[PDB]
Amino acid sequence: KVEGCMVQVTCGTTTLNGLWLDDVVYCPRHVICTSEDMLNPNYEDLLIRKSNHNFLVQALRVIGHSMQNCVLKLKVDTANPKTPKYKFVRIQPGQTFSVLACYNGSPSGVYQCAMRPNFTIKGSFLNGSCGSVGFNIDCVSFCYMHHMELPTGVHAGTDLEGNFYGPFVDRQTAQAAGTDTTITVNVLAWLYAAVINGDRWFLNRFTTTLNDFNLVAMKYNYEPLTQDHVDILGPLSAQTGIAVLDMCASLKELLQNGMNGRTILGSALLEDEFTPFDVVRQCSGV
Amino acid sequence: VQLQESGGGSVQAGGSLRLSCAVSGYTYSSKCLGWFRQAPGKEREGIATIYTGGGSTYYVDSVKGRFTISQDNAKNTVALQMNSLKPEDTAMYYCAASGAIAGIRLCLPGHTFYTYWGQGTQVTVSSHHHHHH
């Protein structure tokens, strides 16, 4: 039974399901990646980081790691006792197969599935999870492993040899498509540019914290601010004498109240296309 | 460094005008070029900018798309095509140039970020009519 083979694999922050067959645990190779790495990952170098002790299997100690295309094959010290007789096969779209959805290493349910012509599975059950496997039962013919979640409940996966179905890669951005989140540090840089240009009407008497600001930012679909963003704006804060957190408080008021008919640098909208590099270089000559 | 604008005049609401500015005496390096406008009593405001490096353009919300800023380093001209003009577009229009600046992408629309200025050409968009329906 696939339920007994399902295990939880953790590497650093990332955690997903794995398939435990004999002393090998199969899982998506992107478990070694964080959100920053998933952008466009150097899997060879990121795997050079990871050693056998970095991977954690919960059903266990890994005695070896071998990457085959997009699947990571982890040799473990304890062989799996209830391993079914299995084979690895590759299906085509429109052929039915059963997928056992697991979240945090514990199974949820068994769903009948069929890949669409674009090689994706449309289904909400796989969302929030990663690593669930598909199979046909007669021998257990494993045919599928869930790798990627796409915005509208659309899921991409590989076979058990690690080859993706369709033209998909295990790469993704931190922000989903259609989010359209405003780039906070760019808005702040543009506000500093407005002050250096003489626009002061929006500066208020208040300061704020990262936590308080980020509550507002999430409410209005702005990128939450980090200390790294704060440091980036360092030159502009020093030029104007206005602390970043003070400017954040001005922006918070602008988000909650709007511009109330006024403009900033000639615009009735808060602008986020100017990067701090653009602004710092242009403000330096002033 | 010298700058001279061209192409202003009077037009009816919904009309079109093309401004041109002769960038002269410049080092032919990467620069910020901007089109500014100023109404009587109102402050001067940048409305369209272009970076002669990568050619990225910025427009304020009120004139975006309707106005298109252009560059012609071969003829050393920066242009502003103004379509679907509105009476509130009535102002004196100035072209402006920064000093040399490399490595950036987008030019800010503030007057503080520009060094050389043209003389300014007037654009007048009128709403007068004399016909009934």
Author numbering:
A (entry chain A): 12 to 70, 75 to 153, 156 to 303
B (entry chain B): 2 to 134
Please share text taken word for word from the publication where this structure appeared:
The viral main protease, known as Mpro, or 3CLpro, plays an essential role in the polyprotein processing of viral replication.
The structure of Mpro in complex with NB2B4 shows that it binds to the α-helical domain of Mpro, and is far from the catalytic site and substrate binding sites. The conformation of monomeric Mpro is designated as the extended state. The aromatic ring of residues F291 from the loop between the E and F helices inserts into the hydrophobic pocket composed of L107, L109, P110, and Y59 of NB2B4. First, R106 of CDR3 forms a salt bridge with the carbonyl group of sidechain of E290 from the loop between the E and F helices, and donates the hydrogen bond with the sidechain carbonyl group of helix F D295. Therefore, NB2B4 is specific to the extended monomeric Mpro, and locks the monomeric Mpro in the extended conformation.
